[PDB]
């Protein structure tokens, strides 16, 4: 049986921007099949609405076993849009988003739909005298850098796969939609590093990461003096490519000790794992 | 008057998973209004017939002034079936590629669609026993921190920009579809750095990321002895990892000089520029 | 004129290590003459008594123009002492802190004290597991660099020159005690970087190690499963160790512009000031 | 029982700033109590008298077992006069010194003190024109990071704990107290490193920041030409701060092995010890 | 039987600058004597002929059993003129030279000759606007990290050792003079790096080097523009430097397991091996 | 006129191993010709003879207006019987060497002979424990990147550069013989960078190399056990590994200013100058 989805993306976050990828990383898994919609970066109310219905117009024909709306912030006016047409709709949904999507968690619930909130998956500097397309793409290279290495792109890559399966079991309750808030205690209950000096780097770069949601924030939505601002985001960017060193860094841990964690997809979309560089995946 | 434009994104390069955002990096731009649909990682002729289909059929409400199809190799059959439909459909088109849709240039040309075709977005190395999501997300964040800071992505929303501006004198010939070939010597036209060191070291990151494109061919596509492939595609990110440590280096000595140069979108859609970080872009 | 004072140190802050130190980096101020007194790292009740006694016990004889009191917290029972004995004490008084004195602020101006409550001057990870002796001298390294290379301690320097001055001119009223409260923001009313990368990477230091405080708070007061605290500790001594590399890399920009800014103490206390390497301070 | 002691401080080196503080770093130990007094960076002859004074009149009513007096030079005029105050007193005296120190060994041995002289403690760039606060304080950090990651504060605590449990058994005889001399050879026999390499890069940095010592000497002392002694006594510094680096990497081979030894103390004030990053000390 | 050789230098090469010194590192060796003359950098016909020469006119009474010609490109003029030379002497004989020289690599067996072509052994940036002395040396030290850590240079000491065993064995055949090409994939056959990750940073630094060849080959021979030229072959030096440091890196790696190799020569020129940094090399 | 020297090379020194190559570094100068003998590594009485043996038999018809003889330890017998040799031979004479050359320094005045002793140009670690192959290799290339990035050798080829001249006026008194001893201090007179930071980095870069030379002396000739002896001399080269890297930093802060110090030979063998990156060498 092929599994499959609609991934809807309005606006960006690190996660929202690899999240279908990181299930297919080499194409050969036959037992999946997705189609991605989205209104680029905008995530304003008609914009969301129309990106849903794209995903909506296609589902009659694709017939999606769950769809999956990610970009910044589920409350804001243009998500909470999306969080309710996909409720109302007959397809069982998860939503992508990040450390303000908590305020409207219990909401979520009672919507019916499943959550993954990136808490690390910070805001950027997105003040005009400052973030151009370049430094845009450079910080989400660093963020990007970090949510891999790290480990957090293999939690959302398991939340997935858990639910793909059930996809293929043919039914998804509500008790099957995922759950999770993840920051960076989440490393805490994984066994993703060998090293445990190699998972405190990728605990600090998490812990800085989200912590650049803050400073993004101030310059961004409280600091009205642009002598104040423009320093205050950059500040933030400063911060996010020190988490991509920190998270760099554990990787070169593990790779020290030849015990870097793979856990690839087989054709049949098994997952696999393996520790040792000239190790089968199994 | 307001540019429409929808993205097709089959398979995964640096360049088309970021060409949409590029152009509007703070979604503050009132002159634009893209749509982007995709059948994610894999790029067989069925899916790329699919999500062209999905373009056009979402084109007949939306009309839009140009349809861009990005991914690997214009030369495959999928991305081949793609210029097809897309060179005899009534829509203005751009192909976003690698070096390996340099054996299609010619007939691209023949087919009237232009295209950007980016040397040093060179594939991963995609053997199962060493890409795994995590690795496939590190390769990816190592590759747009050389695309952005060496400057190929400003390149990149140059080109569309002009696109852009084009559209809305509301007719796009054949003579206005850019046809760009990019790789380390384009730097040499262009006024990107103010120092010539940055210059050079952004210059060697292109060439070594071009490079990494051979070494991952060799082995996926040659060397068929797992005991030599592995090491192989993994000295292929190796090398990438250094040509992003590169690029970092360039953008540091620009910071040094206070010479950064930043081209931000206006709410108008004007693209703006600045070098020194406290001056207003202009 | 022969300024006079006492410093009274129990716990321990990066600020409070040097306060004194910073006054007269070379030893030939000769208008200036310090007695220390201190009951090392302990800081309950008893201790703090025992140490602000023989200031006072000293003062007698000694006749200080101020005496300044510095340790961690200034809201724990210990320092809540020593701010009673020293506000009821015929000598003006300035009590050096962290953020958690934030609590006490407006008490201790009601005492008639003056404070320098150091935001990213963050409690270390206090656990027997984690932290040995050499553990925590390198954590004080790391704490010492952030707060010297980012200019911190240029603006405690600056606020005792200034008291050493009104102390000469015979008469210090609460209005010369100095109420300062330091943190990333503050470089951004301050001159002290020629290069603004210098500045925005120093405020990203300043940041992290704020940041710090929280992550050996709740490794070392809130969680209780040494499984969980260990790491949270290690992971907070991991982020500073990074801040002191961003306080080192803008140091080095000031180095590439030859525009290090060092004010460095004449004989008769006069601060000097300079930027380039070669040139004589003035 | 509680064993008491009480430190001098006059001038600074990295091994007197933080020597009490290695014994009890998290302030938990019950069975030591110490007082701490000094005339700060001031270390002329009637300056080291007046802190010695300090001492001996709190030790009426402190009643220490021994008394530590900590500075640069003990063959300078002002430690000199320590050495002859602590000689004549009734209190076992313990001398904290640098390689001058090494002039009055013999002297020291036939006055009954014990002594810790401190190769690598290297005297710093004392020019008006080089060494402001900052920079004052920035070579003490990276001194600091040196004197800690090498082990060679390790090698001071472990001599204090053994006087300290001596100081308990109630008699301290002139054969008990400290007489060391420590540099780069030292480690050889100690296992402080697990990996080889991490001790001899260890080594290496103990190596030059003992020769700072002769730099900076050349610069302060014998150099007349201020074109010629600012650049001599700012390399130094670029010296000690090359040092620090060394011992960093040193420590991060450590981590690469989950090899860090820690030796923390318990509240009884034995000293514990563990090498596994998730180890109890024991 | 003490082993004789003479070698023969005319222009420059990472590994021709070495080979000699490859085979006797202490000068202990009682096995091996040798005699070395070249014309320094010049390696046009008549000075190549005036070196063989000198090699000719020497072995006469010398008597070496072997003589080895190093330098650029076997098939230039001057490298021509001498394996004509050393073809028709009595002596066997091997050409060291780059990867140019593998166009005449048939011709080289037909004369009987014996080669290694080392292809990272890389042409650098030789333009008067940019290569001056000082520049030429550094981006030696850079190539010959390169050839060294990578384990380059330790296959041709190999190479050599095994031919000196058979002139001691006092006869050398065309079937015993080395036949070598020297890629990054040699490192796949040999058993180098203990760590996979070392091997594969070692395999990308060779890679890197070989790489820089063509771009100098592009900058020197074929741009003729010197606002490209310049930047063009100082972009190859870029890489050169990144080439090392990525040697370094594996090098470190190995330092982390304590498993560096080191193959010695005894004194009689049996050549030793160890890993442990402790462990007698046997 | 075309000058003409034969270059001496017995042992190895990074700048005997450089020398004649400083002298030509494209081969394009057309005023000068050179030939280089030497004996390899070995550097005992009886090599050393027949390298200078060698020199001579060929000076006969060559007819050099000077002799060079470059190598370690001139004080040492095998370069003692050389400087006697060439003294008494009809040609003039330089000697390159190392700072135990100082010893023999008022000698070879008085034997009529120049010199260059480069006091950074340190002796390694050889014990065969430590040093094989690629070890001294290794040492070499970081030895190397220190002399040049330094500007040491730009101070050795300025040197023969003017004696060229000299010879080209074809009379070489012993006036006009070099007379150099070359260390850290050497940077104090010159206007090798543009940036003073750079300037005292390369200053510690040059200090450390020097300061590694008694270390190796230590650990080959002084110091018995191998137990002891292993590790010092790692820890040698651990220093010229940190040196070398001082003195990349130091070059980079020269490209930061676009003022990196060039000077080429033009064909005619005339000295050119330049500093930004774009100019033409005049
Ligand atoms: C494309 C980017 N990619 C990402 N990628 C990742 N991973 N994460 C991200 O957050 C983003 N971005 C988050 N984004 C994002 C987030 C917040 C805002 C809102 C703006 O931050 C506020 O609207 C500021 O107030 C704008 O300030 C505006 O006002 C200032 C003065 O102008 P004036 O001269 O008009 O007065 C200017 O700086 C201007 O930009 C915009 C974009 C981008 C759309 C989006
Ligand atoms: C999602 C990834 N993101 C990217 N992102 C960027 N920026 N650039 C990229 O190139 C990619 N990737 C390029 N991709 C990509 C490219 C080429 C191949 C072709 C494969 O390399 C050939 O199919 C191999 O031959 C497969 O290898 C197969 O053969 C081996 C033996 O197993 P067996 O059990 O079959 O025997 C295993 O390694 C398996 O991997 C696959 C995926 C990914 C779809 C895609
Ligand atoms: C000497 C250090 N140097 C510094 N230097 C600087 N710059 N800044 C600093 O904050 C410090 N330190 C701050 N310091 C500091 C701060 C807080 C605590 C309190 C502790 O963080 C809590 O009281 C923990 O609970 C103790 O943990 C205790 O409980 C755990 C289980 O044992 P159990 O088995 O008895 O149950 C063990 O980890 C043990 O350490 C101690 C020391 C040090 C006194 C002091
Ligand atoms: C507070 C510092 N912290 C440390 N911390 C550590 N860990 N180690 C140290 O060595 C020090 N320093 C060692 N200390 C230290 C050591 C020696 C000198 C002696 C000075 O080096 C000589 O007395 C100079 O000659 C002064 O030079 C003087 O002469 C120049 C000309 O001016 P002019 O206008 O008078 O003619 C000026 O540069 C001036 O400083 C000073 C301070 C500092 C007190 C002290
Ligand atoms: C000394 C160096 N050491 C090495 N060491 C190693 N390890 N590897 C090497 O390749 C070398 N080198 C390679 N060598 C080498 C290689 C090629 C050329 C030929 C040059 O690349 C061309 O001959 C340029 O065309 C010269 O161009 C000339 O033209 C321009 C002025 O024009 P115009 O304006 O005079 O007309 C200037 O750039 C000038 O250099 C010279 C030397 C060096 C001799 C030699
Ligand atoms: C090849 C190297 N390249 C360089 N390159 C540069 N730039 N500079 C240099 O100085 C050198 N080297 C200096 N050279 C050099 C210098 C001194 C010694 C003297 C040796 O250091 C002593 O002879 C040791 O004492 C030997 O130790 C011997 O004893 C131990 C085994 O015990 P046993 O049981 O054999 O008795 C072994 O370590 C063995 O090597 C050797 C070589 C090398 C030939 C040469
Ligand atoms: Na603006
Ligand atoms: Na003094
Ligand atoms: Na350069």
Known sequence: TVAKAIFI??????????????????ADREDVEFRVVGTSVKMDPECVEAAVEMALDIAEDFEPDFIVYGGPNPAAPGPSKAR???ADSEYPAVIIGDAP??????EMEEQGLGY????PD????????????????????????????????????????????????????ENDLPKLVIDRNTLLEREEFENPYAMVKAM????IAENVADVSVEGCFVEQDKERYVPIVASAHEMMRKAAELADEARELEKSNDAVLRTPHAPDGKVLSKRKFMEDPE
């Open 84 to 86: 309710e047409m996909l």
């Open 9 to 26: 993306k309005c606006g960006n976050l690190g996660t929202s921007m690899m999240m279908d990828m990181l299930l297919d990383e080499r």
């Open 122 to 173: 910070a805001m950027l500097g997105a003040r005009r005298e400052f973030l151009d397309p370049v430094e845009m793409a450079i910080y989400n290279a660093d963020l990007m850098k970090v949510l891999a290495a790290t480990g957090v792109f293999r939690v959302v890559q398991e939340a997935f796969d858990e639910l793909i399966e059930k996809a293929k079991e043919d039914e998804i309750s």
């Open 101 to 106: 999507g908590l305020k409207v968690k219990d």
């Open 204 to 207: 600090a770069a998490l812990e």
């Open 116 to 119: 993954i909130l990136v808490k």
